[PDB]
Curated annotation (Swiss-Prot), chain F:
DNA-dependent RNA polymerase catalyzes the transcription of DNA into RNA using the four ribonucleoside triphosphates as substrates. Belongs to the RNA polymerase beta' chain family. RpoC2 subfamily. The chain holds residues 55 to 104 of 1392 of the full protein. The lineage of its organism: Eukaryota, Viridiplantae, Streptophyta, Embryophyta, Tracheophyta. It comes from Nicotiana tabacum. It comes from the Eukaryota. This is DNA-directed RNA polymerase subunit beta''. In plastids the minimal PEP RNA polymerase catalytic core is composed of four subunits: alpha, beta, beta', and beta''. When a (nuclear-encoded) sigma factor is associated with the core the holoenzyme is formed, which can initiate transcription. It is found in: Plastid, Chloroplast.
Amino acid sequence: MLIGLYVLTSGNHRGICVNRYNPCNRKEPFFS
Amino acid sequence: QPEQEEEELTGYELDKRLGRPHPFIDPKTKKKIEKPLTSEELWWNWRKPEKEQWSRWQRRRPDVETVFLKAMAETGQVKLYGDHPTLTETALYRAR
Amino acid sequence: IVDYRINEEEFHKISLLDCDFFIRKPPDPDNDVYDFREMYVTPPDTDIYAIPRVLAPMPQKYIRCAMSDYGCYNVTEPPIDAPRDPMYKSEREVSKVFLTKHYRNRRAGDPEFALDFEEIYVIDSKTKSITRAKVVVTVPGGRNRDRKNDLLVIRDNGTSFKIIPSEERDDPTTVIEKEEWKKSRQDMERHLRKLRDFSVSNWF
Amino acid sequence: AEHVRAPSNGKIKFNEDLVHPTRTRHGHPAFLCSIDLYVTIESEDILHNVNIPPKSLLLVQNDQYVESEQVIAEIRAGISTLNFKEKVRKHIYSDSDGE
Amino acid sequence: NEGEEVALQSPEAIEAFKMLSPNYRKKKISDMGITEDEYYAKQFEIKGEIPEP
Amino acid sequence: TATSISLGIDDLLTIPSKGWLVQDAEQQSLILEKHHHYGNVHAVEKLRQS
């Protein structure tokens, strides 16, 4: 049960892990 | 400041900012070092043996990361210093 | 210490986390006019009045201005001692106040309303000081550039001010993403430096 | 009980007049510090500054190249008398017959 | 003889520390004004009373 | 159940620097053994270093 709760709240990759190149040279869903 | 004109166009600087493959230590700023103490001058505890000694750890460990890095290097997706991947390079791959 | 107790009904009161700042109020219909000639600062919610540190030239005439607050929300979990005691507590915590000149001392109602971003004054909680900002207009158009296509970007804890054209603004995701990338990159290098093969390696 | 290790690869520079000579518990030559010292390692890219204020044993000599993650010195900060002290006897034995 | 993990105070010990280094030995021998071969020979010398001929 | 965690042989990662560290410790230990033999270190001292 603890494993499941941790996975839900663990999160997402933030910088180098999610984008290869700096975001400078160049998330989307919005829900109500 | 009507025209914003800041330009990092040197290959190293541009590559580092963008994130493209590049050498970690700048080739230009690498600096030579005065010779260190010779083996003889050092105290015994720190003196390398004259004949190489056998160990069970003499050969590098086989792994999935090394195989993939080599394969991608041939394709051209990554450029690596050298022809065989290093331990730091393998660590970065696990992350990305 | 001034030694006189003022009538605060005639003063604008601006509250910051560690201080209360008072500036004189000339009478007006919408309450937007300010005199920087008289000012006093007081420890929070206490009434011994004192003179502020002024770090810049101040206006000598009435100016119509707009006020905004800069700061951080603090959410704390407080100890629970009774059956329905609060589970969380949230506080605004303002640290700086920015006052911006209305253009040509014009009024909100007018069709011609804009704000002059060239003149912005800052009040700082920690130092009990009032100063004027340094803006860098990078927007071509010269001094006469239209004030209907102007946006100000404030970064760096309130210490950087720039005016740029409107369409060239960055979306909210890009600002967050850019920051994360910088921090994450620097952190990985710090980890990998310890390894003995770092000099002979390549970022990829 | 803490071992100062090396930040990066390079030559270790320090003044030897300040430190005083000794032999360690494991038999090696070493230097003992009773004043604070600054030791620098000159990696080609950068200079690393490390300090050893408490009585410490420095196990390196000026101009020695030291690789990363190698124990360069020992803090030995703790100075507590032990009531758990126990004297023990080891016996050496002979590997060949003779006089 | 001195103790453990203690600054070496006896004069003989300090010289022994300095001689664990090859350069000190050569520099010192030059001061004594002897050839390299001579140092080797003095090592193999007879201590104690030397008898009369 | 949906994420389905499991453990495999190659998920038991080891720190990148282990080989270098074990190899160096072994060198120090060999050198001390030659020296016990030649008379430059005593026995309580060998035990302790190890």
